[PDB]
Amino acid sequence: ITGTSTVGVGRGVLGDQKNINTTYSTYYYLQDNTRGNGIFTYDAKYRTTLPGSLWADADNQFFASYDAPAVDAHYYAGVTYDYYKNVHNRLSYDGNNAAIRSSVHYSQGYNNAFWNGSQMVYGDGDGQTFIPLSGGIDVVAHELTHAVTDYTAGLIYQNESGAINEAISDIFGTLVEFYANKNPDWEIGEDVYTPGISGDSLRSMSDPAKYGDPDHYSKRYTGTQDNGGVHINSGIINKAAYLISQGGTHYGVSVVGIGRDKLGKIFYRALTQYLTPTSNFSQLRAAAVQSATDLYGSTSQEVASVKQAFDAVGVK
Ligand SMILES: [Ca+2]
Ligand SMILES: [Ca+2]
Ligand SMILES: [Ca+2]
Ligand SMILES: [Ca+2]
Ligand SMILES: [Zn+2]
């Protein structure tokens, strides 16, 4: 809407206070004009019609329980925008400052979040499996990264290309989590998953097998569930990315870590310059090797470490 940029204050899903960029025109709307062509957050009102209503608030204070998922969707979308702009010189998901839209309170007891081709969408969870999913910065950045992928590599959401698609979202979701530097880790969704169980998460990049996901190509899932295992075989690529960044020895294969920033540079370049809609795991390895070669040279430790990491997960 047309109005003047304002700064509200609220509490997120985990009870943390934060300022949010709003817009004033009769009401205070969750519309952040300070980033690109805007970040807009909507109320889906427990229904499934999208996007719903642009979030309006009478007093610019967002401390009600019902406000918390909106506060976090809005704020963490801003953090993710900042990461792509400041770290990769990328202006929003299309590279041309496209408006970023999110809807919260999607459906009733909805244990998921997603990018629908046009916007991010967050369930509230059923209170047992999940609390409102926008409470997880890695979750928010995972979903917005699907938009980046849609506009760049375009990895088809099935089989190996879809597992790369998922891994790309987990990798950058985690790198955004580290960029915000609150409580960062190599796990996915720990802040919103199972409020009654401490120490777990949806997936682990450091040890995908902890949650039943493969950590080696020989253990890949080949059935039809989950679009051919896109959230399962992502563990093979997640483990390789973890190894590139942090190093380690895995199935007897030693990898020299090069750190999170170089991992992000290599995979961002692969995503935007080399990967295609049909790329498989072997093609991702080639794309990552070529990206590391572009950035650091063919004789570099970075190229050597990328090869070691894909070797360790059985991807040639
Ligand atoms: Ca209020
Ligand atoms: Ca964390
Ligand atoms: Ca995490
Ligand atoms: Ca938990
Ligand atoms: Zn995803």
Layout of helices and strands:
Elements: E1 4-11, E2 17-25, E3 27-29, E4 31-32, E5 39-43, E6 53-54, E7 56-57, E8 61-62, H1 68-88, E9 100-106, E10 113-115, E11 120-123, H2 137-151, H3 159-180, E12 187-188, E13 203-204, H4 225-229, H5 234-246, E14 248-250, E15 253-255, H6 260-273, H7 281-296, H8 301-312
Parallel strand pairs: 1-8, 5-9, 9-11
Antiparallel strand pairs: 1-2, 2-3, 3-7, 4-5, 5-6, 10-11, 12-13, 14-15
Bound molecules: calcium ion (CA) (4 copies) and zinc ion.
Residues 177, 183-185, 190-191 line the site of one calcium ion.
Binding site for Ca(2+) 3: 177, 183, 185, 190
Binding site for Ca(2+) 4: 193-194, 197, 200
Binding site for Zn(2+): 142, 146, 166
Short description:
With 316 residues, the protein is α+β, with helices and mostly antiparallel strands. It has helices spanning 68-88, 137-151, 159-180, 225-229, 234-246, 260-273, 281-296, 301-312, and strands at 4-11, 17-25, 27-29, 31-32, 39-43, 53-54, 56-57, 61-62, 100-106, 113-115, 120-123, 187-188, 203-204, 248-250, 253-255. Strand 14 and strand 15 form a beta hairpin.
